């Protein structure tokens, strides 16, 4: 037991499989955010549905009661924390028009790409597996670290990484023992 594991299951299905009008639109998301498969396209769509209908359940209530502020602002606290929500869109009627791509801009795969460490959208997403990425104490293998807005000033390479110069091959350092030897 006890409490085995809560479901919280992602990989939300499409209600119609072979629509061309969604078929072209998903690959434009991969055309910029070159993700692993279509399930991760659901995964951020899975996320905003928690943001969509729950905030929509606030809108049917009136000003001014507690939960439209209490659950209201604490959403907006976290929504401006993650960095998709600016200061001009403060009220709850300004948050439902948030598109899916703003969360995609905050992704660790492309935040290192819009920063000058990666210089390509496919040279970006391969470095996270080999762990040449550090945030202030910690290296992260996970490409889905998706960063809060305060964590923009600190994202860079690792110290144990070959950049900037820790075991710089190290397989290439054995390679000079092969061709020169």
């Amino acid at each position: 037991g006890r409490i085995p594991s809560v479901f919280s299951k992602t990989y939300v299905t499409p209600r119609r499989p072979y629509e061309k009008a969604r078929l072209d639109q998903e690959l434009k998301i991969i055309g910029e955010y070159g993700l692993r498969n279509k399930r991760e396209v659901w995964r951020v769509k899975y996320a905003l549905a928690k943001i969509r209908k729950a905030a929509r359940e606030l809108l049917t209530l009136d000003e001014k009661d507690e939960k439209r502020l209490f659950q209201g602002n604490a959403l907006l606290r976290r929504l401006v924390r993650i960095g998709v929500l600016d200061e001009s869109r403060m009220k709850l009627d300004y948050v439902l028009g948030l598109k899916i791509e703003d969360f995609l801009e905050r992704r660790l795969q492309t935040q290192v790409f819009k920063l000058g460490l990666a210089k390509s959208i496919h040279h970006a997403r391969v470095l996270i597996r080999q762990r040449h990425i550090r945030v202030r104490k910690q290296v992260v293998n996970i490409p889905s670290f998706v960063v809060r807005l305060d964590s923009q000033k600190h994202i860079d390479f690792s110290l144990k990484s070959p950049f900037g110069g820790g075991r710089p091959g190290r397989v290439k350092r054995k390679n000079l023992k092969k061709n020169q030897g």
């Binding site: 690959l27 991969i30 055309g31 070159g34 993700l35 692993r36 498969n37 496919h122 997403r125």
Partner: protein, 58 residues
């Protein structure tokens, strides 16, 4: 009627039976997503085709 059930799989008895044996084993799925634009961008300029099909051989 149960007269004769002999020729069951007759077209499996008249096969030419040619194989594949070749053609450059594919890449992984994210790399499979990468090629889906070079055949989709400029080739594929979408001019006046007058009722044309995308995956036509000839």
């Amino acid at each position: 009627v149960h007269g004769s059930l002999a020729r069951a799989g007759k077209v499996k008895g008249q096969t030419p039976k040619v194989e594949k044996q070749e053609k450059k084993k594919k890449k992984t799925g994210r790399a499979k997503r990468r090629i889906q634009y070079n055949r989709r961008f400029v080739n594929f300029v979408q001019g006046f085709g007058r009722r044309r099909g995308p995956n036509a051989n000839s």
